[PDB]
Structure 1
Amino acid sequence: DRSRVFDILSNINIGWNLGNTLDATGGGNSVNAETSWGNPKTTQEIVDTVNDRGFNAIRIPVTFANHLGPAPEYTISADWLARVKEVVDYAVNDGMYIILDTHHETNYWLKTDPNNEAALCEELAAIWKQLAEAFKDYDEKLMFEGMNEPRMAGSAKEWSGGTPAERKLINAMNKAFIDAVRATGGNNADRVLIICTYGHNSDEPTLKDLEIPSDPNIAVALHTYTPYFFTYVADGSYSVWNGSKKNDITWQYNNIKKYLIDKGIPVVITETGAQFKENTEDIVRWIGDYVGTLDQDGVKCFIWDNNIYHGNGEKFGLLNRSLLKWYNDDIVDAYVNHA
């Protein structure tokens, strides 16, 4: 009976990611990591703006690696832990639903070598112990997402759900995360804990190998930027959305239904979105078909927002943070008015 998790999640309209911010990896062991990829320092007003628009849930991606002391304690630098808490507190002040993750640990120590299971699980646990202790007294609207796209960067199946041995390591790492957090007690005894597949990938073999914990206060996170050739820029990509490719979404969603939804396991899409390709109308239609698909089973999503829109890079930006105005009100309306 996982119903408590379903009830909590039903309160989300739709979510938003503070992308390329606390997850950025420049600046070393410094709070300046936050601004190292060109975003401004986050403020209460940025977060208010997101909330006021209708994204009443926020994912706060955070990369810890360069702020950790040495093994085996892996102590999170006090400055960094305090800045992370300040940022979460912006959302708490506004009554938002919140996901805190670990993020580009995958550039650093989180490399899914099944022969290194103990060192990986131990680091993951040590980090989460400290985070769980710090946010112990936060209420049930704060959720923890243990890993982000855990994988072996550079490997052949990096983006296709890994190998069977790697999928088994992910199960062990998910378990370690849950264990470390539950052991701190307080509100962490039943806080929603969001585990993931390999690479947050949703292909059938990857779902099939996912161990479902007996803990009743968990959800499964996936990233479905689907279809890839619409949302990303690549050889074969297109900017037009007429519905002919809706079946890529449906087929993929049918496996999420088979292994998760129809087994009563809560699922959350913790990242999705479409890069802006001077195709407003197309993106508005894609959101209808993509989010319309998740709405059939009350599945919630969090849209990736890296504040890149006019400039070079992946143009997932929605809020112009420095002006506190939305880059594209029609795309944003389709998200916040999806229901």
Structure 2
Amino acid sequence: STAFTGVRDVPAQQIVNEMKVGWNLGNTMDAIGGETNWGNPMTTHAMINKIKEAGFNTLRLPVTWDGHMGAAPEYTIDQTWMKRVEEIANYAFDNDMYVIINLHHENEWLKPFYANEAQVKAQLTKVWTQIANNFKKYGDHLIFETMNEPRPVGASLQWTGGSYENREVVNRYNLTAVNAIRATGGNNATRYIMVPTLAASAMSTTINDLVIPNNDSKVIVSLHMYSPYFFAMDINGTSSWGSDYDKSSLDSEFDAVYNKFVKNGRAVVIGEMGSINKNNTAARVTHAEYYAKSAKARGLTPIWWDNGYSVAGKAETFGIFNRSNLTWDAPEVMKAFIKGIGGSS
């Protein structure tokens, strides 16, 4: 097990390298209303075994805590919920994997505005204090991600960089979250931590305004890059990918991240990416393999968003693993992604 291997003092880039390539247990512990509320089966050790066998070395474990905690001032998190997150993490540690645990769909309380700041900070502190306390003994194969995609809600703002206000308050929240984690002491004082830009966007506005809490070298940047948008995400966007223009455009997105962070020693994880199923396997194969090798060439570790929904022709069909069958619903795509990542032997 990699659960309790202690905490190294290596540069975060080395950790990101070992993380290698990851898979999200999406629409699960992040589902509003509980683990099985969004149509996934209860998660098993056998499922995670398959994820490791495929070539993934990181399990991102997104968790929505809203709905599982009491009121101010303590915001006590339900103990069964906490221990269930821990149980699933150990499925992965048994496989010698890295695990990332975050706060996910917390928009009902985590609001990046000056007017909400004081109260949100208080809640963030209590929430992270409890999570960090529960996982204190775990070594550096456990990575905390302070928040998911903190942003102003409101349809017209969905793909924007928000306001200077929002970006400033997000930076303040990341600091509050990191300090709360570190204040519990032990391995939490030295473990690696991921922090997002506003909306975890890699756009210039948000990556240029990111401030690393305490300038901490143990901090890793968290970005979500479902690129290119129309191919990867839009049920009505093109089902083709692979032209010289496509490749160059994807390279350029990564180059922005390489130049801002990676080449200056600031490590970066793409904690979510992937494509939906437009019944276009050959295109998704070309895209997945190129995404993987292009991202890896910029020092980036990509993590596939798998929400357990893989039906051809429907929106949000990012699922590639069949959890009920323990087989791959999109074997070619998965294999291509892994193949693109390469390896050291």
Same fold by TM-score, threshold 0.5 exceeded? yes
Provide runs of 4+ in structure 1 moved above 6 Å. Answer: none
CA contact (8 A) 2:59 2:97 kept: yes
Q: Which residue of 2 aligns with 1:38?
A: 39
| Distance across 1 between alignment mates of 2:39 and 2:318 | 14
| SS at structure 2 position matched to 1:298 | coil
CA contact (8 A) 1:202 1:223 kept: yes
CA offset at residue 92 of structure 1?
1.5
| Distance across 2 between alignment mates of 1:158 and 1:82 | 33
CA offset at residue 242 of structure 1?
2.3
**Unaligned stretches of 5+ in structure 1?**
27-32
Equivalent residue letter for 1:138: Y
Give a deviation string over 1:210-232, Cα, whole Å, max 9, x none.
Answer: 11231121100000001100001
| Distance across 1 between alignment mates of 2:235 and 2:36 | 28
Q: Which residue of 1 aligns with 2:80?
A: 79
CA offset at residue 190 of structure 1?
1.1
| SS at structure 1 position matched to 2:59 | strand
CA contact (8 A) 2:111 2:117 kept: no
Q: Which residue of 1 aligns with 2:6?
A: none
Structure 1 residue 138 and structure 2 residue 145: aligned?
no
| Distance across 2 between alignment mates of 1:221 and 1:98 | 14
CA contact (8 A) 2:144 2:194 kept: yes
Moved more, 155-164 or 126-135: 155-164
| Distance across 1 between alignment mates of 2:20 and 2:180 | 30
1:1-40 maps to which residues of 2 (within 5 A)? 3-26=10-33, 33-40=34-41
CA offset at residue 189 of structure 1?
1.3
Q: What is the aligned length? A: 330
Give me the TM-score of the superposition, normalised by structure 2: 0.92
Q: Which residue of 1 aligns with 2:338?
A: 336
Equivalent residue letter for 2:24: N
Cα-Cα RMSD = 1.4
Q: Which residue of 2 aligns with 1:179?
A: 179
1:55-204 maps to which residues of 2 (within 5 A)? 55-106=56-107, 108-154=108-154, 156-204=156-204
CA contact (8 A) 1:161 1:202 kept: no
CA contact (8 A) 1:161 1:197 kept: no
1:267-282 maps to which residues of 2 (within 5 A)? 267-282=268-283
Equivalent residue letter for 1:220: V
| SS at structure 1 position matched to 2:12 | helix
Give a deviation string over 1:133-171, Cα, whole Å, max 9, x none.
Answer: 000000111100010111122153332221111000010
CA offset at residue 313 of structure 1?
4.3
CA contact (8 A) 1:240 1:282 kept: yes
Of residues 324, 327, 336, the one that matches 1:325 is 327
CA contact (8 A) 1:201 1:222 kept: yes
| Distance across 1 between alignment mates of 2:104 and 2:226 | 17
Identity %: 38
| Distance across 2 between alignment mates of 1:146 and 1:74 | 17
Give a deviation string over 1:161-198, Cα, whole Å, max 9, x none.
Answer: 21111000010001011100111111111111100100
CA contact (8 A) 1:136 1:188 kept: yes
| Distance across 2 between alignment mates of 1:60 and 1:8 | 17
